[PDB]
């Protein structure tokens, strides 16, 4: 009965901008991760620190599912030890990340003829994100000596740009949906178990 709701994460009708990435907490269910890896409908399934074929007889204190939108060229950026716009200012993994990064093309889904402009990313920040940090602030970025007063202008940027997802885009400028399963084990009960134990 109480299977974990990976459906409502992976098959959500609308996703989320990468700067405002979405986290689902998984709890008091049993995870059938075989549904994941026996799918024929991902382009990338990169697991660090864990073997997804070997965690349906294992239990974790909590599992987190992070969901968002980026672009082809940027998928290789969700991954320990990476740098770039997305790893630095948007979504950061730790160097000892334990979990999976799952990704698929979503052009049929996340492009319009006019150009999708509802997916945003962050373009500047005053410092790098810490792992599993989320900044949603829309303060003007001060790139020069002179201080802006919440005003856009010279050496003063609004800190989100849109992606320009048009269906005719090049192969790696199209959008990909991404899910990041991460796993914790504490000195506290487990609640997320494979169907085997």
């Amino acid at each position, epitope marked *: 009965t109480n299977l974990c709701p990976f459906g409502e994460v992976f098959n959500a009708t609308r996703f989320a901008s990468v700067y405002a990435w979405n986290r689902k907490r998984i709890s008091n269910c049993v995870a059938d991760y075989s549904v994941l*890896y*026996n799918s024929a409908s*991902f*382009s*990338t*399934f*990169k*697991c*660090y*620190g*864990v*073997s*997804p*074929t*070997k965690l349906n007889d294992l239990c*974790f204190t909590n599992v987190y599912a992070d969901s968002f939108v980026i672009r082809g060229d940027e*998928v*290789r950026q969700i991954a320990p030890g990476q740098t770039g716009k997305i790893a630095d200012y948007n979504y950061k993994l730790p160097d*000892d990340f*334990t979990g*999976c990064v799952i990704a698929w093309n979503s052009n049929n889904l996340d492009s319009k003829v006019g150009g999708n402009y509802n997916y945003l990313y962050r373009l500047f920040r005053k410092s790098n994100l810490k792992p599993f940090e989320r900044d949603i602030s829309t303060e003007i970025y001060q790139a020069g000596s002179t201080p802006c007063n919440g005003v856009e202008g010279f050496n003063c940027y609004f800190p989100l740009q849109s992606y320009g997802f048009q269906p005719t885009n090049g192969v790696g400028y199209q959008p990909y949906r991404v899910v990041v399963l991460s*796993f*914790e*084990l504490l*000195h506290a009960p487990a609640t997320v178990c494979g169907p085997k134990k």
Partner: antibody
Amino acid sequence: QMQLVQSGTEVKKPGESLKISCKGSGYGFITYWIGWVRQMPGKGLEWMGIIYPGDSETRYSPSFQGQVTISADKSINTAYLQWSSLKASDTAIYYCAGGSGISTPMDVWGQGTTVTVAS
Amino acid sequence: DIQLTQSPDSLAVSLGERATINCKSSQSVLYSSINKNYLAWYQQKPGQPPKLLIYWASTRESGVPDRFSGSGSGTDFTLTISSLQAEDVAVYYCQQYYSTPYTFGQGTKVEIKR
């Protein structure tokens, strides 16, 4: 679940180039990284490098950096390992080995391919 | 870059008795996120591909008898074959899979004593 079938045995001459293959048979291959291990006659196991076929990310061991090339072709769940110039000292068995995940155990192997360089 | 020394290099033990092999790593292999050491044990016999026997230090792979067990933390690890049997003669390697490059120990040979 996964089985790894490896290419047959090879007798080459020193100088010649060589590509050997290891093809993953099974669902879930998207999640698999494939590693290459050398065993020289009578000796222990050396890890050579590893590749993720999904995007062809490649690590090597400092002993094998430069000396071999680990490619992959993700449309046929195959990993490759190749020299451009074989020396006598490349005589060995080569095992490919897989695990779903990186920094996870290598929990499936091929039955090895033996390379002879020499007449 | 992580280096492993096994010992002993050779080990003779009587049928039914307990073999212990030690593995030292030059650095820790503990991940904090899940409290677990990133160390495995393989066995190999002539003409055969390594078999995995134990991972996360102390967990048993399928198809492995209950007489195989692993322990240890930080930098000291142990493989223990209790009630050694005939078919348990073989070479045993400890591998670390904490980061690449992955590394094996130099190998411990195990014989029966008669």
